[PDB]
Design an enzyme around this catalytic site. Structure first.
Site, PDB file in Angstrom:
ATOM      1  CG  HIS A   1     -25.825 -21.038  65.870  1.00 25.56           C
ATOM      2  ND1 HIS A   1     -26.860 -20.306  65.570  1.00 25.56           N
ATOM      3  CD2 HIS A   1     -25.871 -21.643  66.755  1.00 25.56           C
ATOM      4  CE1 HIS A   1     -27.803 -20.924  66.630  1.00 25.56           C
ATOM      5  NE2 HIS A   1     -27.009 -21.737  67.264  1.00 25.56           N
TER       6      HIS A   1
ATOM      7  CD  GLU B   1     -19.386 -11.744  64.897  1.00 22.24           C
ATOM      8  OE1 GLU B   1     -18.558 -12.297  65.601  1.00 22.24           O
ATOM      9  OE2 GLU B   1     -20.571 -12.149  64.714  1.00 22.24           O
TER      10      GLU B   1
ATOM     11  CG  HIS C   1     -18.812 -14.658  62.745  1.00 22.16           C
ATOM     12  ND1 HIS C   1     -19.705 -14.971  63.448  1.00 22.16           N
ATOM     13  CD2 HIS C   1     -17.736 -15.169  63.672  1.00 22.16           C
ATOM     14  CE1 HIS C   1     -19.480 -15.262  64.748  1.00 22.16           C
ATOM     15  NE2 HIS C   1     -18.221 -15.397  65.101  1.00 22.16           N
TER      16      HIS C   1
ATOM     17  CB  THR D   1     -19.762 -11.941  68.561  1.00 20.81           C
ATOM     18  OG1 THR D   1     -19.412 -13.280  67.756  1.00 20.81           O
ATOM     19  CG2 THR D   1     -18.468 -11.247  69.012  1.00 20.81           C
ATOM     20  CB  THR D   2     -22.708 -16.691  69.473  1.00 21.44           C
ATOM     21  OG1 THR D   2     -21.624 -17.052  70.112  1.00 21.44           O
ATOM     22  CG2 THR D   2     -22.352 -16.453  68.026  1.00 21.44           C
TER      23      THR D   2
ATOM     24  CG  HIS E   1     -14.219 -14.772  66.168  1.00 25.84           C
ATOM     25  ND1 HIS E   1     -15.575 -14.619  66.414  1.00 25.84           N
ATOM     26  CD2 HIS E   1     -13.482 -13.830  65.511  1.00 25.84           C
ATOM     27  CE1 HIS E   1     -15.826 -13.382  65.816  1.00 25.84           C
ATOM     28  NE2 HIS E   1     -14.683 -12.756  65.555  1.00 25.84           N
TER      29      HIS E   1
ATOM     30  CG  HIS F   1     -16.279 -19.781  65.474  1.00 26.62           C
ATOM     31  ND1 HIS F   1     -15.934 -19.700  66.590  1.00 26.62           N
ATOM     32  CD2 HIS F   1     -16.589 -18.522  65.034  1.00 26.62           C
ATOM     33  CE1 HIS F   1     -16.307 -18.548  67.367  1.00 26.62           C
ATOM     34  NE2 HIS F   1     -16.846 -17.807  66.456  1.00 26.62           N
TER      35      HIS F   1
HETATM   36 ZN    ZN Z   1     -17.033 -15.677  66.369  1.00 24.97          ZN
END
Ligand code: ZN
Ligand code: 47J
Ligand code: NA
Ligand code: NA
EC number: 4.2.1.1
Length: 265
Positions: free
Chosen positions: A69, A111, A101, A203-204, A124, A99
């Site tokens: 991901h 996000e 995005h 958010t996942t 994040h 991590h």
């Molecule tokens: Zn995240």
């Protein structure tokens, strides 16, 4: 084989992306989901908010992992070596991983949004409340996590990001990991620690509603070349058809009964 023909595990494609997640994870439609749009004019300055205390000098990074991901840079969270205190928090939160995005194009990838503006990526830094003993117990609690969110805009290079960029060759595909010791996450911070905060979620999937979000007002600048290298990663495993790891972001969710607070005016 390709995942869309094999298993319907969650992801970011048309057939398994954010609009599908609610089937397996019904909390996707919950009352404190993330991310959200930050409407800068309707955020509320809160004078009871404290400065954020980021104590990363003793951090111990360990490994970088492509999890299919994103990629996670993992830390030793067995002691209070890299902790977040203060701000809106009333406890000590240990750094477990960070991590990002990011998008397929520089105009998308974050996000959270700011007045509907998207950044090229979003960092994040995930921390868990030490009173719950372990991350797994912390994500059974409404104050279990604190996530420090930092926007990435494309401009000048971020020197403290380059070690991350450089290692990505070695973790191209899902399930690959590499040593990532002696990385200093202080090199990913902006100058100012002024922030917005609100209660939200991961958010996942599993989208758990455990997070005190702390989103910094000041983006970091990264170069086009740095974020372009993120986009050469793969969602797939080795020996499977190549699907570039891009657009691994969830769009803004309804604010519902929440009011975003600002540490600054
Ligand atoms: Zn995240
Ligand atoms: N990608 C593997 C795959 C696809 C289909 C239709 N059947 N398999 C085994
Ligand atoms: Na508080
Ligand atoms: Na390399």
């Amino acid at each position: 084989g390709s995942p869309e023909f094999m298993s319907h595990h969650w992801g970011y494609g048309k057939h398994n992306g954010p609009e599908h997640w609610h089937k397996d994870f019904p909390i996707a439609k919950g009352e404190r989901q993330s991310p959200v749009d930050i409407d800068t004019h309707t955020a509320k300055y809160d004078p009871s908010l404290k400065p954020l205390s980021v104590s990363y000098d003793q951090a111990t990074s360990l490994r970088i992992l492509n999890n299919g991901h994103a990629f996670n840079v993992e830390f030793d969270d067995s002691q209070d070596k890299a902790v977040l205190k203060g701000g809106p928090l009333d406890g000590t939160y240990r750094l477990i991983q960070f991590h990002f995005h990011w998008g397929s194009l520089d105009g998308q990838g974050s996000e959270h949004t700011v007045d509907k503006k998207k950044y090229a990526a979003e960092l994040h830094l995930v921390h868990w409340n030490t009173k719950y003993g372990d991350f797994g117990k912390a994500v059974q609690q409404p104050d279990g996590l604190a996530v420090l969110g930092i926007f990435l805009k494309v401009g000048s290079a971020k020197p403290g990001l380059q070690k991350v960029v450089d290692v990505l060759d070695s973790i191209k595909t899902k399930g690959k990991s590499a040593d990532f010791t002696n990385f200093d996450p202080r090199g990913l911070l902006p100058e100012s620690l002024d922030y917005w905060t609100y209660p939200g979620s991961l958010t996942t999937p599993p989208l758990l509603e455990c997070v005190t979000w702390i989103v910094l007002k000041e983006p970091i600048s990264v170069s086009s070349e740095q974020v372009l290298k993120f986009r050469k990663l793969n969602f797939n495993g080795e020996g499977e058809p190549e699907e570039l790891m891009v657009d691994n972001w969830r769009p803004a969710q309804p604010l519902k009964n929440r009011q975003i607070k600002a540490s600054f005016k």
